Amino acid sequence: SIKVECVLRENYRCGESPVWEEASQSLLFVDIPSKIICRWDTVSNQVQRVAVDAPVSSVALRQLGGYVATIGTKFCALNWENQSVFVLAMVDEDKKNNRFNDGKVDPAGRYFAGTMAEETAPAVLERHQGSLYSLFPDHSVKKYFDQVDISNGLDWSLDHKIFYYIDSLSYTVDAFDYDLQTGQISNRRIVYKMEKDEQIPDGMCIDAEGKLWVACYNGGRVIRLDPETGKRLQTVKLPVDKTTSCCFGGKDYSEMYVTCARDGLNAEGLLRQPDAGNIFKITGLGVKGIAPYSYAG
Ligand SMILES: OC[C@H]1O[C@@H](O)[C@H](O)[C@@H](O)[C@@H]1O
Ligand SMILES: OC[C@H]1O[C@@H](O)[C@H](O)[C@@H](O)[C@@H]1O
Ligand SMILES: OC[C@H]1O[C@@H](O)[C@H](O)[C@@H](O)[C@@H]1O
Ligand SMILES: [Ca+2]
């Protein structure tokens, strides 16, 4: 009784960073090269978009009101009403051609996000140019580690002592010891090795049983992993190859939303994947996810 359905047919170039906003029953996400932050009201079925002046790679809820996003190499704050967007902090001013990629807020309201050299084609870029950062409620920025190829999916264990992290071109899901009170991490190790047919690990979220779900870019699937054993538990395929990310949403976080891309597909690829770029929902997984945390600054 697992069902995969295409639920929003808007043909995004590279849908990414899905987050469920329970208060409005809306899905927030981005379409990266289209430079828009999107909010899809699942009830009225209307989509609203805020255009920004650079590629926008993630979006998160802002506790005091509105949203935050990573635009270019800048952490930004958004007031949805006035469509006002302003800079909270800048990173990689060091770099001629970087951008943020995936980001998510930690259980203490810190906005974690990492960067990458900009691509000329999917996974074609100058190597090791990224770093992982976090924006504290302070608006101060902590830099964690560099030498990242493409900073990607991330989440936190339910006990808040472990941080899970994907650098896409490492083809592994990694884990760190994590301290909730300070936001520090330590002891990086591999917890899952991607198989060849699982292609590039991209976005990731944890479920209520502590298992990890990873979107497989080019693999046309999400997989469920046990970070304690390093074994895959489950695979769910989708009719689009460039599955980018996933999050839980809907009633009690019982439904999974999956984003995907059409960028990089040739004419044949497009015809073979008519729903490339659209938003998918997966029902009947038999597990629930958890609420997103809101940024505390
Ligand atoms: O800045 C505006 C936003 O503030 C949030 O706290 C509300 O949940 C959104 O519906 C609103 O659009
Ligand atoms: O060396 C200085 C540079 O270090 C980088 O890691 C930071 O992101 C830059 O913003 C800073 O200017
Ligand atoms: O690494 C696979 C893909 O992951 C996405 O998060 C990035 O935005 C893309 O640029 C990248 O090609
Ligand atoms: Ca991604």
Numbering used by the authors: 3 to 299
Give the exact sentences the study uses for this entry.
Biochemical studies suggested that SMP30 is a gluconolactonase (GNL, EC 3.1.1.17) and requires a divalent metal ion such as Zn2+ and Mn2+ for its gluconolactonase activity. The crystal structure showed that human SMP30/GNL adopts a six-bladed β-propeller fold, which is similar to those of squid diisopropyl-fluorophosphatase (DFPase), drug resistance protein 35 (Drp35), and paraoxonase (PON).
One hydroxyl group of d-glucose, OH(1), was coordinated to the divalent metal ion. Residues on the opposite inner surface of the substrate-binding cavity (Cys16, Ile202, and Tyr219), however, formed no hydrogen bonds with the bound glucose. Due to this asymmetric arrangement of polar residues in the substrate-binding cavity, substrate/product(-analogue) molecules are placed in a specific manner in the cavity.
